[PDB]
Amino acid sequence: SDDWEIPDGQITVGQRIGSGSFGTVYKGKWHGDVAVKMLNVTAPTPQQLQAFKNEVGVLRKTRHVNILLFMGYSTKPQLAIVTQWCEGSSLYHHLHIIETKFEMIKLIDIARQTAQGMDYLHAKSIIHRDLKSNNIFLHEDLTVKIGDFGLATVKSRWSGSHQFEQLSGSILWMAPEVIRMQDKNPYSFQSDVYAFGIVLYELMTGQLPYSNINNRDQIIFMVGRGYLSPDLSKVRSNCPKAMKRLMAECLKKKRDERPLFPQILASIELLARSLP
Amino acid sequence: EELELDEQQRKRLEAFLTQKQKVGELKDDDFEKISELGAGNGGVVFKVSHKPSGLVMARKLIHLEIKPAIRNQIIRELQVLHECNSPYIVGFYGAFYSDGEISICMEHMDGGSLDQVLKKAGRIPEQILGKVSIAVIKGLTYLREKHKIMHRDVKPSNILVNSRGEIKLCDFGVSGQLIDAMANAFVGTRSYMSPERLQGTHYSVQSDIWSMGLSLVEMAVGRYPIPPPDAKELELMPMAIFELLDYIVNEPPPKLPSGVFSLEFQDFVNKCLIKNPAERADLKQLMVHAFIKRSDAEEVDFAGWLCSTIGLNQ
Ligand SMILES: Nc1ncnc2c1ncn2[C@@H]1O[C@H](COP(=O)(O)OP(=O)(O)NP(=O)(O)O)[C@@H](O)[C@H]1O
Ligand SMILES: Nc1ncnc2c1ncn2[C@@H]1O[C@H](COP(=O)(O)OP(=O)(O)NP(=O)(O)O)[C@@H](O)[C@H]1O
Ligand SMILES: O=C(NOCCO)c1ccc2cncn2c1Nc1ccc(I)cc1F
Ligand SMILES: [Cl-]
Ligand SMILES: [Cl-]
Ligand SMILES: [Mg+2]
Ligand SMILES: [Mg+2]
Numbered sequence: 304s305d306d307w308e309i310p311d312g313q314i315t316v317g318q319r320i321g322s323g324s325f326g327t328v329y330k331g332k333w334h335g336d337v338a339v340k341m342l343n344v345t346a347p348t349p350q351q352l353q354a355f356k357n358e359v360g361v362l363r364k365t366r367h368v369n370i371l372l373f374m375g376y377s378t379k380p381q382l383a384i385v386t387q388w389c390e391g392s393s394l395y396h397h398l399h400i401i402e403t404k405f406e407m408i409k410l411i412d413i414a415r416q417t418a419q420g421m422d423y424l425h426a427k428s429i430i431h432r433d434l435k436s437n438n439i440f441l442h443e444d445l446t447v448k449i450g451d452f453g454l455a456t457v458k459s460r461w462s463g464s465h466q467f468e469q470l471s472g473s474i475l476w477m478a479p480e481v482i483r484m485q486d487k488n489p490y491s492f493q494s495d496v497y498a499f500g501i502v503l504y505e506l507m508t509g510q511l512p513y514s515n516i517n518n519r520d521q522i523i524f525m526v527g528r529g530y531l532s533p534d535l536s537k538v539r540s541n542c543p544k545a546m547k548r549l550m551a552e553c554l555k556k557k558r559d560e561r562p563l564f565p566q567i568l569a570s571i572e573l574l575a576r577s578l579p
Numbered sequence: 580e581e582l583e584l585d586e587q588q589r590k591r592l593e594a595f596l597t598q599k600q601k602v603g604e605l606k607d608d609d610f611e612k613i614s615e616l617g618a619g620n621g622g623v624v625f626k627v628s629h630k631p632s633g634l635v636m637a638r639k640l641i642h643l644e645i646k647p648a649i650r651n652q653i654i655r656e657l658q659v660l661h662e663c664n665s666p667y668i669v670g671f672y673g674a675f676y677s678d679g680e681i682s683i684c685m686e687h688m689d690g691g692s693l694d695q696v697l698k699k700a701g702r703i704p705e706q707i708l709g710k711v712s713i714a715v716i717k718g719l720t721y722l723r724e725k726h727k728i729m730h731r732d733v734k735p736s737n738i739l740v741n742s743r744g745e746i747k748l749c750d751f752g753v754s755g756q757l758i759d760a761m762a763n764a765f766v767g768t769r770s771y772m773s774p775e776r777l778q779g780t781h782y783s784v785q786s787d788i789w790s791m792g793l794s795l796v797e798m799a800v801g802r803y804p805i806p807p808p809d810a811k812e813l814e815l816m817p818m819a820i821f822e823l824l825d826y827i828v829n830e831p832p833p834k835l836p837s838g839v840f841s842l843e844f845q846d847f848v849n850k851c852l853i854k855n856p857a858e859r860a861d862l863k864q865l866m867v868h869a870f871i872k873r874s875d876a877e878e879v880d881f882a883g884w885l886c887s888t889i890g891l892n893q
Contacts, residue, residue, distance in 0.1 A: 321642060400646050437644075447592075459773075470766045470820055482820040517759035520772040521779055524824040530778075 304378075305356065307363050311379040314339055317351050319442040322431070323451075324472025325458045326384070336388035338376055344457045345381055352378070365427055369420030371440065371450035374396035384456070386450060390443055395436035398505050407541050410506045410576065412544075414514050415571045416447035421499060422564040425492050429453055432490045434498035435476040436505050455490070474523060475512055476501045479556050480513065482527035493527075496567065500553025507542040529556045545574045588666040591743075593671050595686065599822075601632040605673040605684055610638060615690070619736070621765035625885045627688055629672075629674065634720065636672055638687070641681040643760050650676060655755035663726060667718035669739055669749035676773050681705035681757075690740035690885050692797060697735055705844050709874025710881050711798070712847070713740065713793050714746035719840070720862050728753055733790035734771045735798055742891055744882030768820060769803055774828045775856045782856035789859065792851025796833050799840065799848075804833035843870040 304310050316339055320328040327339040347355065355376075362373045368531060372387035389398055394413065397403040405413070414520040417439055430440075438451040459466040468484060470477070478497035481489045504512055512533035513522050525531035538547055549570050555561045584592065613626040616637055627638045643650065657674035660683075664670070670686035690696065693711065697703060697830070701709075715738060718792035722728040734768040737750040752758050771793050773786035796804045800816075805823050813836055835845045847870035850860040865871060886893055 321644070395644065400644060402646060440739050467817055468819075469768055472766065473764055474766055475763060483821050485822070511763055516779075517755065518772070518776055518779075519762035519766065520770045520820075520824055521765070521777050522762070523821055524777045525779065526829060527821045528825070 307359065307375040309375045309377050309385055311377070314377065314383075314385065321439070325454070330388065331385070332373075333374070333385065335380045335533075336390075338386045339377075340384045340386070342382040342384065342457050344460060348458075348461055348463060350464050351456060351466075354470045355382075355456045358453060358456050359419065361427075361429065365424065365452070366428060367420060369416050369447050369449055370423060371448040386447070389440040389448060389450075391441055394439040394441060394447075394502070394505070397441060398436060399511060403508075407543075409576075411543075411546070411571065411575050411578065413441070413447055414503060414506055415568070415575055417449060417499065417502065418564055418568040418571050420447065420449040421495060422568045424449070424452055425495070425564050430455075430490050430492065431495045431498070433459070433472075434474075434495050434502065436502055437471065437473075442511060452467070462477060465477060474519070474526075477526075478558065479529055480558055482523055490566050491558060492563060493561040496551065496553045496561045496563065497555075497558070498563075499567070500550055500561075501533065502552040503546065503553065504535075504538075504556055507536040507539060509539065510537055532556065543574050543578060545570065545577075549574075582665065584666065591667060591745075592664060595606070596664065598634055599619065599670075599672060600673050602629060602634065603631065605629075605675045605682070607677040609701065610636075616792065617695070620767045621761045627684075629684075634672070634836070635687050636684045639683040639685070639769060641683070641757075642679060643681060643764060645760050649756055649760060650681070653681065653750060653754050653756045653760065658724065659728075659753050663722070663728075663753065663800065665718065665721040665725075666745065667714045667721060667747055669747045675884070685749065685866070688739035688741045688745075689891070690742055690889060692736045693738045693740060693794075694734070694736035696740060696885065696888060697798050697826060700801075703798040704839055704884075705799065706874065706877055706879050707881060707884060708795055708799060708844070709870065709877060710879055711746055712791070712795060712865075713875055714738075715748065715794075715864055718748035719784055719787050719791075720850065722748070724753055724861070726753075729784055730770075730787045730790075733787045735794050738794070738879075739769050740881075742882060742886050742887055742893075744885070747882070760785060766820060768825055769805070770827070771855065772827065772853050773826070777828050778826055780856070784862060785856040785859050788865065790849050790854075792848045793833070795848050797833060799835060799844075806830075828866075841870075843868075843873060846870065850851070 314331045314333040317330045320330060326342045329339045331337045331339040359376050374385045432455060433451050440448040442448045442493040459468050476498040478494040480486055481494050501512060516522055552562050609629055609631050610627045611630060613628060616624040616626050620855045622639050622641045624637055627636055629636055654674055654676055660671035672684040674683050719730055728751060732750050739747050739749050771790040773789035775782055776786045805826055816839060831855055835848055847868050853859040
């Protein structure tokens with residue numbers, strides 16, 4: 304088989320965890336615990352499989368303390384991604400399911416490690432395209448691991464050489480230009496910055512955005528048209544004012560007005576120092 | 580029961596309540612998988628056998644990553660479905676939680692959804708769509724009058740039919756917590772949402788009427804009508820989700836093709852698709868429309884047409 308490809312029958316596929324926007328995750332064993340994501344694209348064309356293999360070559364060299372380890376992929380019996388298995392819960396489970404009570408010094412540190420991992424991704428010219436608290440894990444409760452980055456080639460079904468991109472999964476983290484799907488490529492470093500802005504909202508408010516709106520199609524249209532944005536008044540009283548300003552800059556409707564992660568990381572680190 | 584039932588509708592409603600009393604508490608190990616009935620953007624439906632009762636049910640399983648307090652409230656609000664009993668509403672057996680999945684057990688409809696029937700029929704005849712409109716109108720009227728429920732998801736995939744000729748609504752918003760939970764979790768590729776609710780304006784069941792007229796146009800021409808068919812495509816007689824929503828808001832509503840449908844049917848869907856939610860006809864106005872009064876009088880062997888379209892036996 305190919306480089307970093309896991310041959311058939313090597314991974315002992317165990318219990319089914321759940322499905323997301325582009326795959327179904329299973330707990331597996333392969334030189335330790337692994338997460339195996341059976342991709343929704345089961346019938347890839349040689350053109351798509353080659354573009355997927357080229358992207359695996361990129362993702363497998365993204366190694367960083369805040370980046371979920373990419374362990375390889377499978378083609379038989381089906382297309383699959385093999386990553387490090389995270390003990391514990393994702394940031395989404397901590398905030399919105401378990402309702403873990405963090406102190407502000409720990410919430411700032413979660414945002415700081417996330418900005419650290421995102422800065423590394425953009426330094427390697429990699430767009431995450433799917434940043435959300437579901438893809439941020441508090442590994443063994445301390446280290447932040449960002450997962451489900453890149454993989455643009457299998458987040459859509461291919462018509463030979465051209466791919467139609469459709470929204471999948473949750474939309475709460477999608478930038479207005481990602482919602483519209485109208486520009487040449489809606490995904491960029493700045494769209495990741497917006498998703499990071501929504502994650503900052505979750506940390507500093509304890510809530511998902513648009514809690515008062517249960518109509519999803521209203522959210523898609525008004526966010527895409529620029530008529531709707533997260534209510535920054537929901538921010539808790541103990542949130543540092545510099546964090547609310549940074550949050551507002553990441554959530555700018557125009558992507559040209561959002562800061563980049565070198566500046567974002569520098570602001571979070573300064574606020575972590577200028578803090579009781 | 581105390582509703583406008585004919586003697587056959589009341590007997591079937593009684594028979595359903597009878598079978599429902601054989602169903603005690605629903606548990607995951609009391610079920611046996613038969614086959615899959617289909618999957619949506621946020622759920623999967625299976626034909627199952629409730630072994631303690633012998634009943635065959637349609638079991639929908641929704642996997643939501645929510646806090647248990649919200650989940651327990653969702654299971655609570657779904658218990659209202661025990662009191663939604665109408666010839667135009669899909670029956671209900673129970674809603675419970677197990678193994679991280681919300682289970683909604685309902686009556687199995689062997690004709691599938693009108694979305695499935697649409698693909699097998701190509702197009703649905705106008706005289707058949709008259710019987711569907713009466714069922715959708717009376718189903719929306721039952722939910723709003725007897726329960727103050729708004730459907731919020733009227734579309735062909737949520738109108739179910741069976742070989743007995745019954746046409747029933749399903750997947751309506753009995754649980755507001757469930758609507759918000761799935762708004763955060765999934766997305767679709769199309770939308771039947773009215774233009775005013777897309778902009779955050781709430782006009783009660785006027786939006787459900789928009790969704791019905793949109794569904795009637797799709798089933799009449801055999802194609803989702805946003806955007807409208809382009810010239811030569813019509814005489815044969817890939818937009819993203821945001822563009823579809825932007826089109827519903829900023830463009831004139833779709834309409835039936837001229838000539839091939841009766842003027843009463845064309846006027847009926849036009850009154851259903853007026854972008855102004857107040858000028859849009861309401862449930863009482865539609866029930867006395869010329870198209871409904873004509874279809875209510877027509878004798879249409881819907882059960883015979885359905886099994887013929889699907890391939891079943893009478
Ligand atoms: N590396 C991992 N270790 C442990 N659990 C994981 C891992 N990756 C995913 N999961 C879990 O597997 C389930 C499905 O994840 P996934 O398919 O990635 O959906 P999602 O993260 O919620 N949305 P998305 O990642 O954008 O598709 C969730 O309960 C995750 O917490
Ligand atoms: N009571 C039932 N009896 C028989 N088939 C059913 C029943 N309920 C649902 N189905 C079938 O199951 C399919 C999936 O249902 P559902 O989960 O609501 O997705 P959907 O409505 O088709 N599309 P969407 O609502 O956008 O996710 C439907 O299209 C029907 O064909
Ligand atoms: O089913 C739903 N959406 O479709 C899933 C996407 O695939 C659905 C959506 C909203 C909702 C609010 N209260 C119940 N709700 C649903 N369920 C439901 C309702 C009535 C019956 I009768 C049977 C049912 F299953
Ligand atoms: Cl498997
Ligand atoms: Cl009938
Ligand atoms: Mg994930
Ligand atoms: Mg449905």
